[PDB]
Amino acid sequence: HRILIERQEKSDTNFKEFVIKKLQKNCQCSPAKAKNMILGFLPVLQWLPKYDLKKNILGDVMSGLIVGILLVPQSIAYSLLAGQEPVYGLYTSFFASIIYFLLGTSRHISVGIFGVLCLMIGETVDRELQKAGYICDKSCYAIMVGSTVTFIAGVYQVAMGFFQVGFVSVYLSDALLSGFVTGASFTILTSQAKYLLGLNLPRTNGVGSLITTWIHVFRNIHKTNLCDLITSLLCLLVLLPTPIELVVVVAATLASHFGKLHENYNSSIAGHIPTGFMPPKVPEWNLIPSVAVDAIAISIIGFAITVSLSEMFAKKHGYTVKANQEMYAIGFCNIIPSFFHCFTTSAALAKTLVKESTGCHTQLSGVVTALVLLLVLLVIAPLFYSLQKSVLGVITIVNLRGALRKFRDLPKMWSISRMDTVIWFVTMLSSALLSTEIGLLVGVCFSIFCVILRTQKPKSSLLGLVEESEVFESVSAYKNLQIKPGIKIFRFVAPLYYINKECFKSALYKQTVNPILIKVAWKKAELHTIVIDCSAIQFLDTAGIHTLKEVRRDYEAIGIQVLLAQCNPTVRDSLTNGEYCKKEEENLLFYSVYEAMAFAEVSKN
Amino acid sequence: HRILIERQEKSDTNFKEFVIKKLQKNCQCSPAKAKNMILGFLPVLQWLPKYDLKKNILGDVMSGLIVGILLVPQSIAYSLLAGQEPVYGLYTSFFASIIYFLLGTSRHISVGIFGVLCLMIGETVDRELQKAGYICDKSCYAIMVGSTVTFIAGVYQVAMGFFQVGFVSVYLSDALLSGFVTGASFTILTSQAKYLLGLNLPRTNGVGSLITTWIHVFRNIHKTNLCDLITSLLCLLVLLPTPIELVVVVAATLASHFGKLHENYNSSIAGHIPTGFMPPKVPEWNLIPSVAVDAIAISIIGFAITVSLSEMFAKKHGYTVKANQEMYAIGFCNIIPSFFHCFTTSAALAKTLVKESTGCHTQLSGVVTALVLLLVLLVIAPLFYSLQKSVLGVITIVNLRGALRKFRDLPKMWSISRMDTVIWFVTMLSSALLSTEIGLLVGVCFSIFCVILRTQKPKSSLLGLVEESEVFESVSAYKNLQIKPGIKIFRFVAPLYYINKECFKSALYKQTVNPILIKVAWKKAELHTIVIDCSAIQFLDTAGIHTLKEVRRDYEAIGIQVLLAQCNPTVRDSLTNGEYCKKEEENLLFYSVYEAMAFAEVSKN
Ligand SMILES: [Cl-]
Ligand SMILES: [Cl-]
């Protein structure tokens, strides 16, 4: 008794008429739903009118001043890492917070300056500064280039949000992103070492910069101020055990101002800007083609990190974050502020962690931080003068510590997925050495190739029956399975295609007869059926269809029957389209391994 | 009653000691087997002493003169396409045949000049000629560059043979190679159009050359000789229906010599060389770094095509061709002749087809061709003077026709594998336009990405039981399957990893409850078990382990049980290593979908 399943009728509707009908059903021209899109595009007018202030005002207000003071050195630093004046980091943070409060659904994430992104902006800035030469007084050209790159990144992000092409985010694996952030953290530490030691080594760019910078540091170690070094050592000793950062920076600034440490030729930040808020300057609009390629990566890593963090903190509690709206928000946190003097913004884990430790479920707290920043941007900025600039490096290293600790999870990573660990290590090496962008590209492709390698050398085994059941499983992995003689079931856990067709043939020949050599031996001068378990064969390429046909023909030439079992509907469709089973030949494809085994047993009898 | 299969004990031998022991068992220092390696490396002293001359001498001798005369215009042409003097093509063909008779196992293949490879050599030659400027009198530098590239390609091929790294050949799919050869044939036709029309348009190189050459042809169409055009039209008319080529070239040469067609400013080949065989010149040995990258592709496409053709013609009858020995042979068909004045060699289908039509199973015929070439290289070369050079273009186009006919198989290709057809079309476009090398790289990566896309959007469905059996199959593909209520089996035919984890979650939520929205609705204010068929899940990434854990946790939060069935041994190992089933929790993983369904039915009762 053979199975006689009947296939369902395929849908005849495949033209664009049905697509147009379903697009109209989607109501592109939506009456009375334009308010919904306005509310969807402006989440701010959805929870502020329904704000439970009596239960969250204290939480939002609390630690907002601490976070704002805590966002203060981060800006004066990463701006320096980005090749920008310190006031530009403050502008970036304030504008990012204010705009994300307008457009934002995570309600727990901390948008603003991201170290990895600032390192990448810095690379593009220095390249354009050199390609140009070093009323653009160096810093003016730097901020112009940074704002242009930010505008391009925001345009790309909003285009990906509108075109619904955000699925590219799936190509950035969590392990690959962790490796990239670790490598970028190593690069940031190497860059900040020069400020930590007080040297004046030249700008190093290109593949191997990390090594060039370290070599320069070693070469110029004798030109050590020994004052900034002492301050940095004390700050590292105090902050390594880990509000501590705010106290440290306040005490360091007070000591530097009182003792006049600059008399020892101590490098310090300058009077960057007064209350300021200078009138906005439009982007270059002519330099836009030159720095588009870098903006590609900046936009991707920016939106990938933001979406990942927002989804994580939404699924933690009250998951109501829309991916497309966060696309639009992170895009507009890089378009409107780029009209002003700001660089790219993204979610920062080290500062979101600070708000998570002390805070509540209200985005209004970010506004408070902005207000604090605004206050810092109005009258408290001169109070930040006379910073030792070694405390800045200590403050950057301490924050990176979060990403640098990932090396302690390598034994745990290995004990779960070896190839994921290898991808992580390769991405970390390619980001630390080589280039940050080149490192990301190397990581994304190596992960895709690892998926190709996993396919390339797959598992292949013989199947045995489980006693008193209709279950077949690998003999090479399980024990005490009945294997009747003259029938050998071969399971090949992989898609059969151009990459692994040779491996499939070699494994089948090694475990069963290898009919080619037998045929040549017969021409010069036990087994009767073989069942191929196609349950794990995901798809079939033209090579796979040809390989299966060749296998069947070569085995039938000797006299060994070949039966295919548990084929997918798509695999069966490919086999019928590939002209494998001829027309109504029958007894060639089976719906289960048990059915094929029973048929093979009956055929000999 | 639950299944209680016991797993086999894993092998404790994993260190390098066992590898060293098996390497010694391989007998690296082999006594009395050095003769075997000598015979293996020199196949010539394995069938010549055992040559059945009485049954194959007539076949080998027959059509050898025709093939040699037929290899004559092919050289005078493709050398011109390769930016070389015509005598260099004759040298290449003669040396390739002679050396492959020494080292060769296919015994039916025709090594020699390959059109696609000559086009690629030409590109590298013209670039180096320009990078240098245009006792190297242009042609001397061209042959020096070509010989250097050939030496590098042969070194790469022999290195791949010795290192056993020939598996790279699996990345060049048959459809991708067919597309590349079609695009390269289009490029060759475009290049030979200038000789067909008799114009003198400038050298065009870079991406889009095909378009630049065609634009130049259209611009200079008015400068048509109308004599070479008439000769080419007559030759095309005669040869298009398709020994015909030899008669055509002989008649054209005789007519040109008798009528003195060169009086009409007809471009013609010159007195390239006398009997010649000038003393060999060593490769550049200093220019070797510059043209290594091009030699990478030349070596790969050369060895891939040669191995494919040899394996095909061996498996057709008497399969005794070793892949590694053919690696060595094709490498040494590019190393020793590069010491002389020759360029790269590979199997040519159009000329192997000529020998297949008229020939026998003896490589000695190739020697005969070499002899003919040698005779042509000794005294018959001046007889080939005064060739119209339009017959050459006609002779190149006719031969390409074999690869150009592939466009007629597109409807057949679509009716078998749509993605393979798309890869073929993309590779053909990237080889015709863009660059030949860039086209190959674009094809190889797009095929790997298509394997990634096939994974990205996979099949997912609900499984129903087949009546009076223990077989579950897709409800969306088959008909009349029992689906008990409260239990829904979800089959996801793909590996679960970072790329398709979101798709897996979305499909499972769409077809079953979507527990997140249900949980938020329950907090604001039928199904009990779900069985996941992991039979088609090939592997599990760190993301896949996390996704499965998250799915189980979220479904158990609502109150819906999640059971995993038919997991691979590797998938089970990943789940245990990933801390998914805790310790001895039981009733979480099942060996069959029927077992899980029975357990789910029992649990409610
Ligand atoms: Cl950071
Ligand atoms: Cl060809």
Numbering used by the authors:
A (entry chain B), B (entry chain A): 52 to 185, 211 to 318, 334 to 616, 645 to 724
Copied sentences from the primary study:
We purified the overexpressed SLC26A2 in Lauryl Maltose Neopentyl Glycol (LMNG) detergent with 150 mM NaCl at pH 7.5 and then determined the structure, termed SLC26A2-Cl-, by cryo-EM. The final reconstruction achieved a resolution of ~3.2 Å, with sufficient quality for model building. We found that the vertical position of TM3/TM10 in SLC26A2 closely resembles that of inward-facing SLC26A9. The result shows that our SLC26A2 structure is open to the cytosolic side and closed to the extracellular side. Notably, in the structure of SLC26A2-Cl-, we identified a distinct density corresponding to the Cl- ion in this cleft. Within 5 Å distance from the Cl-, there are five hydrophobic residues: Y129 from TM1, V167, G166, F165 from the end of TM3, and L491 from TM12. When such distance is between 3.5 and 8 Å, the Cl- ion is within the TM3/TM10 cleft and considered bound. Combining data from three individual runs, we estimated that the substrate-binding pocket is occupied by Cl- ~82 ± 4% of the time.
Like its homologs, SLC26A2 forms a domain-swapped homodimer. Each protomer of SLC26A2 can be divided into three regions: the N-terminal region (residues 1–104) comprising a few flexible cytosolic helices and loops, the transmembrane domain (TMD, residues 105–540) with 14 transmembrane helices (TMs), and the C-terminal cytosolic sulfate transporter and anti-sigma factor antagonist domain (STAS, residues 541–739).
